[PDB]
Design a protein around this motif. Structure first.
Motif, PDB file in Angstrom:
ATOM      1  N   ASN B   1      -2.549  25.098  14.521  1.00 46.93           N
ATOM      2  CA  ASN B   1      -2.108  24.638  13.167  1.00 46.93           C
ATOM      3  C   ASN B   1      -2.532  23.217  12.806  1.00 46.93           C
ATOM      4  OD1 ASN B   1       0.166  27.063  12.705  1.00 46.93           O
ATOM      5  ND2 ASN B   1      -0.468  25.949  10.851  1.00 46.93           N
ATOM      6  N   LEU B   2      -1.977  22.686  11.714  1.00 45.58           N
ATOM      7  CA  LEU B   2      -2.504  21.452  11.137  1.00 45.58           C
ATOM      8  C   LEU B   2      -1.461  20.460  10.574  1.00 45.58           C
ATOM      9  CD1 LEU B   2      -5.215  23.389   8.935  1.00 45.58           C
ATOM     10  CD2 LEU B   2      -5.732  22.474  11.235  1.00 45.58           C
ATOM     11  N   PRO B   3      -0.796  19.680  11.455  1.00 39.20           N
ATOM     12  CA  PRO B   3      -0.505  18.257  11.243  1.00 39.20           C
ATOM     13  C   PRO B   3      -1.504  17.453  12.090  1.00 39.20           C
ATOM     14  CG  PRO B   3       1.109  19.316  12.740  1.00 39.20           C
ATOM     15  CD  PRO B   3      -0.126  20.177  12.670  1.00 39.20           C
ATOM     16  N   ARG B   4      -1.307  16.140  12.273  1.00 40.62           N
ATOM     17  CA  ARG B   4      -2.138  15.391  13.257  1.00 40.62           C
ATOM     18  C   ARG B   4      -1.507  14.137  13.869  1.00 40.62           C
ATOM     19  NH1 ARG B   4      -8.389  16.743  14.441  1.00 40.62           N
ATOM     20  NH2 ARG B   4      -9.188  14.709  15.132  1.00 40.62           N
ATOM     21  N   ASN B   5      -1.143  13.159  13.053  1.00 38.34           N
ATOM     22  CA  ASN B   5      -0.456  11.976  13.573  1.00 38.34           C
ATOM     23  C   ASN B   5       0.857  11.706  12.816  1.00 38.34           C
ATOM     24  OD1 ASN B   5      -1.178   8.401  13.321  1.00 38.34           O
ATOM     25  ND2 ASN B   5       0.389   9.475  14.527  1.00 38.34           N
ATOM     26  N   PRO B   6       1.951  12.405  13.207  1.00 37.94           N
ATOM     27  CA  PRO B   6       3.196  12.345  12.424  1.00 37.94           C
ATOM     28  C   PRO B   6       3.894  10.975  12.393  1.00 37.94           C
ATOM     29  CG  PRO B   6       3.146  14.289  13.854  1.00 37.94           C
ATOM     30  CD  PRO B   6       2.087  13.347  14.341  1.00 37.94           C
ATOM     31  N   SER B   7       3.419  10.010  13.186  1.00 40.89           N
ATOM     32  CA  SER B   7       4.025   8.668  13.216  1.00 40.89           C
ATOM     33  C   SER B   7       3.644   7.834  11.992  1.00 40.89           C
ATOM     34  CB  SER B   7       3.657   7.913  14.498  1.00 40.89           C
ATOM     35  OG  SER B   7       2.542   7.064  14.291  1.00 40.89           O
ATOM     36  N   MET B   8       2.512   8.169  11.382  1.00 39.77           N
ATOM     37  CA  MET B   8       2.051   7.498  10.172  1.00 39.77           C
ATOM     38  C   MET B   8       2.087   8.454   8.985  1.00 39.77           C
ATOM     39  SD  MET B   8       1.019   4.249  10.819  1.00 39.77           S
ATOM     40  CE  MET B   8       0.153   3.172  11.962  1.00 39.77           C
ATOM     41  N   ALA B   9       2.893   9.506   9.103  1.00 40.53           N
ATOM     42  CA  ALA B   9       2.960  10.550   8.088  1.00 40.53           C
ATOM     43  C   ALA B   9       3.747  10.140   6.843  1.00 40.53           C
ATOM     44  CB  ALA B   9       3.526  11.834   8.682  1.00 40.53           C
ATOM     45  N   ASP B  10       3.956   8.835   6.661  1.00 39.00           N
ATOM     46  CA  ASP B  10       4.677   8.330   5.491  1.00 39.00           C
ATOM     47  C   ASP B  10       4.288   6.935   5.016  1.00 39.00           C
ATOM     48  OD1 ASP B  10       6.443  10.076   3.982  1.00 39.00           O
ATOM     49  OD2 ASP B  10       7.443  10.450   5.905  1.00 39.00           O
ATOM     50  N   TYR B  11       4.238   6.807   3.690  1.00 35.23           N
ATOM     51  CA  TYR B  11       3.706   5.644   2.962  1.00 35.23           C
ATOM     52  C   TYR B  11       4.054   4.282   3.568  1.00 35.23           C
ATOM     53  CZ  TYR B  11       2.418   2.777  -1.154  1.00 35.23           C
ATOM     54  OH  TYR B  11       1.867   1.829  -1.990  1.00 35.23           O
ATOM     55  N   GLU B  12       5.354   4.049   3.732  1.00 40.46           N
ATOM     56  CA  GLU B  12       5.922   2.778   4.198  1.00 40.46           C
ATOM     57  C   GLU B  12       5.323   2.272   5.511  1.00 40.46           C
ATOM     58  OE1 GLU B  12       8.072   5.106   2.493  1.00 40.46           O
ATOM     59  OE2 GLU B  12       7.413   6.482   4.076  1.00 40.46           O
ATOM     60  N   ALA B  13       5.176   3.177   6.480  1.00 41.89           N
ATOM     61  CA  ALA B  13       4.527   2.868   7.753  1.00 41.89           C
ATOM     62  C   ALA B  13       3.055   2.527   7.532  1.00 41.89           C
ATOM     63  CB  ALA B  13       4.659   4.042   8.706  1.00 41.89           C
ATOM     64  N   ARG B  14       2.423   3.286   6.639  1.00 47.61           N
ATOM     65  CA  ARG B  14       1.006   3.123   6.350  1.00 47.61           C
ATOM     66  C   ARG B  14       0.701   1.769   5.711  1.00 47.61           C
ATOM     67  NH1 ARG B  14       0.915   8.939   5.260  1.00 47.61           N
ATOM     68  NH2 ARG B  14       0.357   8.835   3.044  1.00 47.61           N
ATOM     69  N   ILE B  15       1.431   1.431   4.646  1.00 48.01           N
ATOM     70  CA  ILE B  15       1.226   0.166   3.916  1.00 48.01           C
ATOM     71  C   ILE B  15       1.540  -1.086   4.766  1.00 48.01           C
ATOM     72  CG2 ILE B  15       3.503   0.256   2.727  1.00 48.01           C
ATOM     73  CD1 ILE B  15       1.570  -0.842   0.191  1.00 48.01           C
ATOM     74  N   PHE B  16       2.460  -0.930   5.721  1.00 49.54           N
ATOM     75  CA  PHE B  16       2.837  -2.010   6.630  1.00 49.54           C
ATOM     76  C   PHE B  16       1.589  -2.593   7.265  1.00 49.54           C
ATOM     77  CE2 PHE B  16       4.480  -4.433  10.063  1.00 49.54           C
ATOM     78  CZ  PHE B  16       5.832  -4.659   9.835  1.00 49.54           C
ATOM     79  N   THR B  17       0.751  -1.702   7.795  1.00 53.28           N
ATOM     80  CA  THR B  17      -0.475  -2.055   8.513  1.00 53.28           C
ATOM     81  C   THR B  17      -1.416  -2.940   7.679  1.00 53.28           C
ATOM     82  OG1 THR B  17      -1.843  -0.114   7.916  1.00 53.28           O
ATOM     83  CG2 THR B  17      -0.238   0.197   9.679  1.00 53.28           C
ATOM     84  N   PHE B  18      -1.164  -2.982   6.369  1.00 57.69           N
ATOM     85  CA  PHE B  18      -1.948  -3.790   5.428  1.00 57.69           C
ATOM     86  C   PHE B  18      -1.256  -5.100   5.080  1.00 57.69           C
ATOM     87  CE2 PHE B  18      -5.111  -0.607   4.782  1.00 57.69           C
ATOM     88  CZ  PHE B  18      -4.437   0.616   4.850  1.00 57.69           C
ATOM     89  N   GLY B  19      -0.097  -5.332   5.695  1.00 57.71           N
ATOM     90  CA  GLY B  19       0.621  -6.593   5.577  1.00 57.71           C
ATOM     91  C   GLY B  19      -0.261  -7.816   5.785  1.00 57.71           C
ATOM     92  N   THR B  20      -1.505  -7.604   6.221  1.00 62.60           N
ATOM     93  CA  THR B  20      -2.451  -8.711   6.408  1.00 62.60           C
ATOM     94  C   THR B  20      -3.851  -8.434   5.837  1.00 62.60           C
ATOM     95  OG1 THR B  20      -1.687  -8.335   8.702  1.00 62.60           O
ATOM     96  CG2 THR B  20      -2.300 -10.607   8.070  1.00 62.60           C
ATOM     97  N   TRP B  21      -3.977  -7.368   5.046  1.00 61.79           N
ATOM     98  CA  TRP B  21      -5.267  -6.951   4.481  1.00 61.79           C
ATOM     99  C   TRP B  21      -5.963  -8.060   3.674  1.00 61.79           C
ATOM    100  CZ3 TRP B  21      -8.192  -3.315   6.222  1.00 61.79           C
ATOM    101  CH2 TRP B  21      -9.269  -2.830   5.462  1.00 61.79           C
ATOM    102  N   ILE B  22      -7.292  -8.134   3.760  1.00 57.08           N
ATOM    103  CA  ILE B  22      -8.053  -9.146   3.003  1.00 57.08           C
ATOM    104  C   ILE B  22      -9.149  -8.576   2.088  1.00 57.08           C
ATOM    105  CG2 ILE B  22      -7.741 -10.661   5.054  1.00 57.08           C
ATOM    106  CD1 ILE B  22     -11.116 -11.028   4.381  1.00 57.08           C
ATOM    107  N   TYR B  23      -9.622  -7.367   2.390  1.00 59.54           N
ATOM    108  CA  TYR B  23     -10.820  -6.806   1.739  1.00 59.54           C
ATOM    109  C   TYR B  23     -10.580  -6.310   0.310  1.00 59.54           C
ATOM    110  CZ  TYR B  23     -12.637  -7.102   6.507  1.00 59.54           C
ATOM    111  OH  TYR B  23     -13.021  -7.552   7.747  1.00 59.54           O
ATOM    112  N   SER B  24     -11.663  -6.221  -0.465  1.00 60.54           N
ATOM    113  CA  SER B  24     -11.605  -5.809  -1.870  1.00 60.54           C
ATOM    114  C   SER B  24     -10.686  -4.608  -2.105  1.00 60.54           C
ATOM    115  CB  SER B  24     -13.013  -5.531  -2.423  1.00 60.54           C
ATOM    116  OG  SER B  24     -13.570  -4.341  -1.885  1.00 60.54           O
ATOM    117  N   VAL B  25     -11.003  -3.483  -1.464  1.00 59.83           N
ATOM    118  CA  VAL B  25     -10.317  -2.199  -1.688  1.00 59.83           C
ATOM    119  C   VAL B  25      -8.784  -2.256  -1.574  1.00 59.83           C
ATOM    120  CG1 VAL B  25     -10.049   0.174  -0.817  1.00 59.83           C
ATOM    121  CG2 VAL B  25     -12.341  -0.754  -1.228  1.00 59.83           C
TER     122      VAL B  25
END
Ligand code: X22
Ligand code: X22
Ligand code: X22
Ligand code: X22
Ligand code: ZN
Ligand code: ZN
Lengths: 100, 101
Positions: B1-25
């Motif tokens: 079947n098809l999930p893959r990485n359920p630890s990042m399966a939600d917005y809040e966890a994902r955006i956290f990782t960008f708490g230091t983002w610098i690039y255009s996108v």
């Protein structure tokens, strides 16, 4: 813009009546569902919502496809079929066209 | 079947990782498109297909790139549909034909 340009034909049931004499290869329920009603000459039909007219249906052709092909600005179409579908028909068409 | 990485399966966890983002996108889009940042450079990765992406130019839209590169992703499909995906892959095809000509 932006209401039905023929509110008398808004109801699907209304539209299906207009096909009593219908005798052409293309399925009347499809046409009715796509938004069209018969005009009362040849195979000519016109959309209830945008007022677009189609004619000369070939035997394989799909109502929903032509509606999007010819009058892709129709808000009924968009509501019933969404934007990406519309983009699709044109893209497919444009690609084939280029391939000749 | 098809999930893959359920630890990042939600917005809040994902955006956290960008708490230091610098690039255009933009940081909120990458998130909505299912990506978290890794650490190294501009390297980012999907959560449901584990699609990796780097070298973001200033004109590239996350969803387009998700479909350009990882079209099978079951998440993508259930966010944008067969149509959107195909439309991305029918149009690069068009571009090529238009510059043959
Ligand atoms: C919807 C009825 C309204 N009275 C009307 O505008 N009818 C026509 C119309 O929309 N089209 C016919 C042209 C003359 C009319 C303009 O008043 C042909 C089909 C349609 C039209 O102009 N289609 C375009 C098009 C393309 C992109 C977005 C919107 C419309 C078109 C041209 C070539 C191939 C497919 C569509
Ligand atoms: C619907 C499938 C069919 N094979 C087809 O592609 N038809 C097109 C069509 O009906 N129209 C497109 C022209 C190429 C096709 C001719 O087969 C553009 C719009 C429509 C058309 O020919 N006539 C419309 C119309 C609308 C505004 C101005 C002039 C013509 C029309 C309007 C009312 C009643 C019937 C047709
Ligand atoms: C979502 C942001 C922005 N509006 C965008 O880039 N949209 C895309 C888009 O326009 N196209 C891509 C598909 C995803 C989006 C469609 O909603 C690829 C196709 C493209 C497009 O411009 N389609 C056109 C078109 C124009 C000429 C030939 C073939 C297709 C289109 C055609 C008819 C009616 C509406 C749009
Ligand atoms: C969306 C960013 C940029 N415009 C882009 O599409 N880059 C591509 C890319 O990242 N990939 C495509 C390959 C051509 C490009 C390389 O410049 C295929 C899928 C993806 C890729 O394989 N990314 C890798 C990677 C790693 C190092 C260098 C180049 C590519 C990857 C793998 C895991 C995690 C992050 C990136
Ligand atoms: Zn219409
Ligand atoms: Zn994915």
């Amino acid at each position: 813009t932006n209401l039905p340009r023929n509110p008398s034909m808004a109801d699907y049931e209304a539209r299906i009546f207009t096909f009593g004499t219908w005798i052409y290869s293309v399925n009347k329920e499809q046409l009715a569902r796509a938004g069209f009603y018969a005009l009362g000459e040849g195979d000519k039909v016109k959309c209830f919502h945008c007022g677009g007219g189609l004619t000369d249906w070939k035997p394989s052709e799909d109502p929903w496809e032509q509606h999007a092909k010819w009058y892709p600005g129709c808000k009924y179409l968009l509501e019933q079929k969404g934007q990406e579908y519309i983009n699709n028909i044109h893209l497919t068409h444009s690609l084939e066209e280029c391939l000749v």
